[PDB]
Design a protein around this nucleic acid. Sequence first.
RNA 1: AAUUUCUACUCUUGUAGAUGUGAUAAGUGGAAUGCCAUG
DNA 2: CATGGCATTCCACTTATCACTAAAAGATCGGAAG
DNA 3: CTTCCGATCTTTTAGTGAT
Length: 1240
Amino acid sequence: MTQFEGFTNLYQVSKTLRFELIPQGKTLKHIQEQGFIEEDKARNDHYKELKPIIDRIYKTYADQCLQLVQLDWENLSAAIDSYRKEKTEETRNALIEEQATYRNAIHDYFIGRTDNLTDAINKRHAEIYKGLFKAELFNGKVLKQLGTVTTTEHENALLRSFDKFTTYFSGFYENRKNVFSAEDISTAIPHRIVQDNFPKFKENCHIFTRLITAVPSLREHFENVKKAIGIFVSTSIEEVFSFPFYNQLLTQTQIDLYNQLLGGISREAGTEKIKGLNEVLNLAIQKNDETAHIIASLPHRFIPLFKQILSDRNTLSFILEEFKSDEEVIQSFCKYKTLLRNENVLETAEALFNELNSIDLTHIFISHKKLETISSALCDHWDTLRNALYERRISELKSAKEKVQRSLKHEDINLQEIISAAGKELSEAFKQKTSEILSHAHAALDQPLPTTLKKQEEKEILKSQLDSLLGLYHLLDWFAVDESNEVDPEFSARLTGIKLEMEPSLSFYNKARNYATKKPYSVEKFKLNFQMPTLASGWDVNKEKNNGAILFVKNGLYYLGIMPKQKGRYKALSFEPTEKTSEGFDKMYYDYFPDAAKMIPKCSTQLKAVTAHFQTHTTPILLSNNFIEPLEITKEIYDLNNPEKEPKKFQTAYAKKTGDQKGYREALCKWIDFTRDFLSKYTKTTSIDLSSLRPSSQYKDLGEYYAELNPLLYHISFQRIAEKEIMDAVETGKLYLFQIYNKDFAKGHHGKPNLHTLYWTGLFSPENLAKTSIKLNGQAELFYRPKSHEIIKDRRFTSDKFFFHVPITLNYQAANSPSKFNQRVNAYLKEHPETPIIGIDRGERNLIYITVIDSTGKILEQRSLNTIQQFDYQKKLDNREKERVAARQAWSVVGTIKDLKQGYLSQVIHEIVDLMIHYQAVVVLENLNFGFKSKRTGIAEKAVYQQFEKMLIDKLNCLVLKDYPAEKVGGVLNPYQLTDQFTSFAKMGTQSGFLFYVPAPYTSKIDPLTGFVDPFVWKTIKNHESRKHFLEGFDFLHYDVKTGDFILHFKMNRNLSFQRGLPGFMPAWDIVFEKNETQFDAKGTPFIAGKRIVPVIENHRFTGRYRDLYPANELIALLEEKGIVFRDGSNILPKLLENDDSHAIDTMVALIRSVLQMRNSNAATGEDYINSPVRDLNGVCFDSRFQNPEWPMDADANGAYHIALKGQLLLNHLKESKDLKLQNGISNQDWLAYIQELRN
RNA sequence: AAUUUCUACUCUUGUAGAUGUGAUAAGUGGAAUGCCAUG
DNA sequence: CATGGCATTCCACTTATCACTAAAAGATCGGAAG
DNA sequence: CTTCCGATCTTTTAGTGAT
């Protein structure tokens, strides 16, 4: 009999707290007189400058090592294909094994253990390999082996700035160690080569060979465009798309050559761009030929490869020069303005366009590709001028129209015919627009430049002048000045001269755009070090004179003490622990031993002396230093930890590989006895009680033993010291004292404290001291941020502050990772079949819409969360989004949206966890693909599909209710754990504890009452033949005279091609065209039944705005226009399908498509609702506007209700699941069949 | 209109909720500008 | 006045790893022997 | 004068997971 309260202390979590340190006493002066702050600032700047210099060495060895790589990729491609055809777990394991094999194979080059290279090269590469993670990067002991790096004197002098300070780069050492590593790490070199770039290359190879097989003419196109680009000249375009060529494309130069081949080299502004492979494929698409329709079906785009990790991009395309200061761009534009005003651009321009009223316009032509711009600038529609040209060429005449359009589409047109075409309105519009543009250019030229670019108004003034000049240049780019057609000579000469004078303005505009849109400089905190290489790395008493960090507790207040190096050496300041009754501070004593897997072999078996002893003679060795009794090590004890193979005989991987469970148990028992002896004899750990440990043979696995053992090694005690000693120490300067401070420690607070402050108080609560539930961690760091009733805005930004980030670890008694979390959750769920379900749906019209259903699916509560605590966050997000959109086009600062979304999601998360605790429910979200959420985030960054899942999973990883007592489940010492330990979204599966994932579609556009979904994908029908075929599948349609509504019948045995291929459980639906009368809801407002909201598509190619539709009214209007009688109640379809007019069938199909659009929304009126086209078997046509609380009110409420039903289906399958598992996703067929089973 | 920090209020020189930091790397999406095409 | 495919710059933004570390090893130097 | 040893401050290192 399990319980909901049993989901606590299942796995450890790690969190970091942040506090402001208040200086205590004279220590502010005593830190200013030493100048440590400026020293750490200069250290940080030197580190920032010197990080890319080391990266050159890493890039150099990466480029050198990969050029020697030679592998066959056939096996990896075969594994990828075999896993691609069917998704089963053993092919997944085979693919994982092949990926690991290839990853190790390439990593052997970096390690120096490959078989395809000589032994001397292997030794040289290994000798290099041992040096990039230690101090020889700075001393040059590994720098000489490459030689090609060629560091000059300034870097070498700046490398000596970090002397005796190599441990600063330790985090950087770990960061770089992830790169040259083979354990499927997403930042690593070989993971990228095997899993990121190679599947893309295989996809590109298969796409290219399918294109070649389908049609052969592009081979000449591809080879010719490759020769025009001039990349990979020594090899063929057939060979470049082959698996042996993937022995190249490891170094960044080859990848950049491939990418520039695929995209095409781009020259500077105003110059024709060399096309790429994807570009010529798109151009082949846009021809709209039958061969274009052939490759429209096929995948018609290659994929570029990803960048190499440590390298940098280089491109053959043009790179624009960059302005470096606002003064520089200001003086450059001022000198440009003086030059442009000295040559007198506007005088010759104005003199040039007034000739157009009085010159032979048969000799003035217009570029054919720019006439659309002229038409859009002169008319309300872009098509007008080309239509006028089309009908005049018709008027001076199937092949005739084709001749007209092919002369229209490519050949430049004389201006005289165009003025003859449009009439006069184009001529006065032309002269008026040219007058407006030169007036704008004149106003920009005369009005001067401001002194600087500090404020946004100066930026928009400069922007306004610049695009005035750009629009002028656009105006001169209208004319076709080329000599292929007739042109007046002096006209062409003056136009070319004024155009080349206007030419450098466009690149100037792009340069100013690049400089102006830079992020403004802000002050930023940096790590303090106090000249300690290992400041606050660990809290231990042995290291307290080295790490220098010591805490004190003073009558509920907390104080951090830092003692510095006195005269450049570690003067061991000491204190005498006095009686408790004496006044003073409470020093925390930190007796801790790290993870025994990481510690016992270090100080027992992997010692230098032991290794030297055992290679020579087999006799056992006694170890006495730092042991209170001499400790013996035997040959086989050393041999288990050092077996010359990866699987140790006490490791369960060896037991899995060989199956020798008996030998594994024996080796494990001997290892446990040995480490028990070590913990008995070691000086640090001889005082720690081990009586809670089980005997050796009772431990199932070594990791279980380690998870048991580690909590015993961590202990905290407190000692009282005289206040006089600490005050004298801080007054002397031998100790810097700071108070850990936040808002909650202020004397004026009365309310509930912050959750972080609750965590901090719970760690130092005496119950946590007695039994360690919340563990203080090491690796603390110090940050200094400079400067950036009576109440002051941004008071915390008014002075420099010292920050203090400290990590803590919770649920410490539990293991570092949970075991079978989802199986425990499913066991509890099977124990409690009546668990409620909460569905969370995300949308853009309304952000969060919740529905709570029971086991039988009845709604207990539904609610929109556009407003929490009477604050409509949706309007604020929408306002912020258009503010950002307007600012990003006005060259203003962009700002951030994350803080406002985080503030909304804080209240949202609190609401969901309150509902979770009050109902003991589960939470279901839709499984959103990364592509879909990224596309909708790009369409609308206001919406919150991402960052809500992360915050949810973070909150249920460890949950503490503030009102709860500290000892209760859900308290600070016993936090709830509802979700699995979050690793990453890639490995996060279909179920994370109490939170589930279901497939997205068929949750909104469906009937709640009946489960009906429209099956007709509408792209199957385009012409009247296919439309009439779609009508033939329907059974009959008649008019009901007693209710005024049409009744239409349909079966899935017809119109199967136009269906989306999902047969429902009902073989028949009764489509009803409700009479468009009005009804009153429960609130009493009138609403029109059967109404539809349809976009305007009258122009047949573009989408307009929204409009209301009344399908019964439109149907009777069309039928009475056709004269078809329907008051007899007869069948209407044969009376209608007999008529062969295409517009009647088009309108009928449009009405059918309109009436199945259950989703009816329009943001202009603020109305969104669902109507059911199919009447329920209880004689009800469902409409959400009736405001029945039994059913969803809105669209997103319906979607939330249906994902809750999907979760209900999953839990119902879980109840009959003997394996305590879940389905590998739910197909749409099973979901729709199940909901149709419930509804019918 | 105060906060380690963020959000929302302002009875309280404050309230409610949230808050895994640092380093590193990759990727995504907008906006502008061109170039080639299509409607 | 829109769409498709590229290219350059700028911005914000998300995702994915690592550490959460005491003690041995070693570099080094001031102080002690031949 | 000429040569080596013990204190002391950096630096690196050790590495576990289901019949």
